[PDB]
Amino acid sequence: SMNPPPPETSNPNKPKRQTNQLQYLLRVVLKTLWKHQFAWPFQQPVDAVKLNLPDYYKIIKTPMDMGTIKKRLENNYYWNAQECIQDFNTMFTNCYIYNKPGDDIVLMAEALEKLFLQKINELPT
Ligand SMILES: COc1cc(C(=O)N2CCC(N3CCN(C)CC3)CC2)ccc1Nc1ncc2c(n1)N(C)c1ccccc1C(=O)N2C
Ligand SMILES: [Cl-]
Ligand SMILES: [Cl-]
């Protein structure tokens, strides 16, 4: 297939709030991962046309990426911190599902996930 539309990044019907946890997710967690050397491939949706991955969306029905997460945080899409944590987890898990233990992109995902866990460890109460 071609690519689906990217995940929604705004919901005008959903109320908005900026909590200490959401602040930390944007200013610390997302910022740290985004600026990591390995971030580029995760900064926008998987492009199955450009990467020549005809079966990507047969396998991955819940795509996610850090570009989407960034936009969601910057747009105040998330009401609960858990929504954002779940998106990071989906992004990493999809990479492990589609690819193989040896692969460069998997090594990159694992490094980013470790960093994610180190940062989320200090998520405020
Ligand atoms: C802006 O998005 C991307 C840019 C590039 C890219 O042009 N370069 C330039 C060449 C560069 N190399 C130069 C040669 N060197 C030895 C290694 C580094 C690596 C980065 C490469 C990949 C990009 N995007 C990308 N999105 C989602 C994917 C994914 N890739 N990978 C690699 C996957 C590959 C196959 C199947 C799935 C994925 C995947 O799960 N993710 C998350
Ligand atoms: Cl997309
Ligand atoms: Cl399909």
Side-chain angles (χ1 to χ4, degrees), residues 28-80:
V28 181
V29 183
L30 184 281
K31 183 176 177 180
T32 296
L33 274 62
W34 189 267
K35 295 191 177 188
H36 191 282
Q37 176 57 52
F38 294 160
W40 190 26
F42 297 95
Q43 286 178 351
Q44 58 288 306
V46 172
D47 187 325
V49 173
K50 291 183 183 197
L51 296 165
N52 204 34
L53 308 176
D55 61 348
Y56 187 81
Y57 304 102
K58 291 296 184 191
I59 297 175
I60 299 304
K61 297 297 191 186
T62 312
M64 187 51 56
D65 67 280
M66 220 149 49
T68 294
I69 292 166
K70 177 177 177 295
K71 290 175 183 196
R72 284 176 173 196
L73 284 162
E74 293 181 333
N75 295 344
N76 275 85
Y77 176 90
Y78 298 124
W79 181 259
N80 293 325

Side-chain angles (χ1 to χ4, degrees), residues 97-114:
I97 291 168
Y98 189 82
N99 303 285
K100 312 286 186 292
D103 300 344
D104 292 336
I105 193 66
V106 168
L107 297 180
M108 294 172 74
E110 288 176 3
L112 290 169
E113 187 180 17
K114 181 58 180 181

